[PDB]
Symmetry: C2
Subunit: 262 residues, 2 copies
């Protein structure tokens, strides 16, 4: 399980201000803390508030790699900002993301290959986020074929079925688990899977509990990565424990510690 730190996101007040005032301190501190928690990748989202998003992404990249060697997950719907971020990246990167829309596929897949970066693909297109697992799977397969079409190693493709809040979109959770399981059954080399975990508990009571529980469930269905709260110790425990229960990581009494220091 690859935990992709979610905190460096412009939606958060302290990050929005840091980006605006170009104050590296807050961002660099969240990079450190998240890595200390066990994250091995860092999601970098400038947010919708900042004016120049291209320049902002570049900045987030430069200030972050100054204090971290972790993989940078460039999170933005602005492809120009993504490209700009990649050109500044000193370490392996992740593109977050592309969807099944053909127009975006032919821009992001080649872009991912050009930079040897990982690519996150959402199971959806202009038509919207499908509920039924069969439809989500269909989009996933289109992404799979795309990885082969453009020469992207299947292992660098992370398919995201898009989890939603369990209190107002509850019927989506099981459809997500089913999609992940179907994707897990694909032949070698099979693609990977990811999820913006925290969305499952939006507006719910005891979000950490919901987050933990779903992470464990998702991992049982093949989940390989999760953009989530790397500073949530209980969550990190689950990640570590889940790997053990899937026999992905050999057991030892300090399995939690080993996960955070590997």
């Amino acid at each position: 399980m690859l935990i992709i730190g979610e905190r460096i996101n412009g939606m958060f007040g302290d990050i929005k201000r840091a980006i605006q005032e170009r104050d590296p301190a807050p961002v660099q501190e969240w990079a450190r803390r998240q890595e200390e928690g066990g994250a091995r990748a860092l999601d970098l989202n400038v947010g919708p508030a900042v004016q120049d998003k291209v320049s902002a992404m570049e900045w987030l990249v430069e200030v972050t790699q100054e204090v971290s060697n972790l993989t940078l997950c460039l999170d933005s719907t602005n492809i120009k900002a993504i490209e700009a971020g990649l050109k500044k990246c000193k370490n392996r990167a992740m593109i977050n993301s592309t969807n099944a829309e053909r127009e975006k596929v032919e821009k992001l897949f080649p872009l991912a290959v050009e930079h040897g970066a990982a690519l996150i693909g959402l199971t959806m297109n202009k038509t919207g986020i499908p509920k039924d697992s069969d439809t989500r799977l269909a989009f996933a397969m289109e992404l799979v074929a795309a990885a082969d079409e453009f020469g992207l190693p299947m292992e660098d493709l992370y398919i995201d079925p898009l989890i939603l809040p369990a209190n107002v979109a509850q019927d989506h959770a099981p459809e997500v688990l089913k999609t992940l399981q179907q994707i897990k059954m694909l032949a070698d080399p099979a693609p990977k899977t990811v999820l913006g975990l925290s969305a499952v508990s939006q507006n719910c009571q005891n979000r950490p509990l919901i987050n933990r529980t779903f992470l464990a469930m998702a991992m049982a269905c093949g989940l390989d990565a999760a953009i989530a709260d790397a500073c949530d110790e209980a969550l990190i425990e689950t990640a570590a424990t889940a790997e053990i229960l899937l026999n992905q990581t050999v057991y030892c009494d300090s399995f939690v510690k080993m996960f955070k220091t590997r």
Copy 2:
């Protein structure tokens, strides 16, 4: 998710003495505590220490139903003990258990049917516990066929893949999840599944964490019931959260309390 209180088991020192001394207090207290925790079924195991296991099982049934209306899960390898127990039960019972051995099947399935009781079936026989999910599933299918043969409603059949410690039999864990998953399919009306959860963390560190992490993972694979620590609040939280994430129970802010007071 049906939590079957595991605590009234002769292997525990206090229960062993209570049975040997015929002191109802310890047993009745544990019965009430487990129900309050959220259990809706109580496992009753006289343990190996007591000499007369048939009258010990009758006693457990007597002192327990005296204070509890909960379904009683008669846990014994001695069929005479199970029979004597069933005859003492005033409420519907559960039989734990029968394995896939034909000789055992033709005695227990008819016994469960006669008493209108639930029956637990272990995916194993005289050759032992199969590690590979293929063989676990093979025995699971025999049990399903036997239920049809003897007239046991498929919903009263709980198949147990038999989980083992994650520190010495770690490769069994993923096989158990796969088996549960394949069982979840088969054909409607599909049978139910159960597990002696606590075995997964035996002799491990951070046992509660390992238990609840696996419970969640198991539930995503269709687990229906679990013999476990109904007095472990964190375990109960996981069960309640898992039902929500599978859309088996409608979300509401106090879903945990609702699960417990259900």
